[PDB]
Write a protein that binds this ligand. Structure first.
Ligand SMILES: O=C(O)Cc1c(Cl)cccc1Cl
Length: 167
């Protein structure tokens, strides 16, 4: 049993809810919250901007030190950093950004990072400002992640379309 409440069960291991990932993290304090990161860990907008704002910019300060030491992530890659006030850990995962022309096949590689964690609160990778089709992102998630993933979808309209269209 875990703390997550109000989710619809899609599969054995994948759950979904219409929720603000920031407000969900604040309530649950999950072991792992996933950030929709870019390779520079520049948390300007979308999910990353919202998570970072909720940490009062402490996520960005930590991230800048990580990049200064290690250099940029790979598209499809990840790093584990602090969850600050939101979670124990933040798994920063880089899905391909269609608005930069990145290979959508890298979305499966991105989701494979989730398998290193038994339970996660996450957004749909590569959707939102990254430009991918969220329906596709959900299919790749279900067909790739084997650990228990709780997906937060902010827009009620997209949430309802993801559920209604789910095979
Ligand atoms: O949650 C939403 O409504 C839209 C959304 C964002 Cl903002 C970021 C990543 C994935 C998705 Cl699906």
């Amino acid at each position: 049993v875990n703390s997550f409440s109000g989710y619809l069960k899609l599969t054995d291991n994948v759950y979904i809810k219409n929720a603000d990932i920031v407000e969900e993290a604040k309530k649950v304090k999950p072991t792992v919250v996933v950030n929709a990161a870019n390779v520079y860990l520049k948390h300007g907008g979308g999910v990353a901007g919202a998570l970072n704002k909720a940490t009062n910019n402490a996520m960005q300060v930590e991230s800048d030190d990580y990049i200064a030491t290690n250099g940029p992530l790979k598209v499809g890659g990840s790093c584990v950093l602090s969850g600050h006030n939101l979670a124990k850990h933040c798994l920063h995962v880089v899905g391909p950004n269609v608005n930069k022309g990145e290979d959508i096949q890298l979305l499966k590689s991105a989701y494979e990072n989730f398998n290193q964690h038994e339970v996660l609160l996450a957004p749909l990778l590569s959707a939102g400002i990254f430009g991918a089709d969220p329906i596709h992102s959900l299919r790749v998630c279900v067909d790739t992640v084997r650990t228990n993933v709780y997906l937060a979808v902010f827009d009620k309209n997209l949430y309802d379309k993801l559920v209604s269209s789910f095979l």
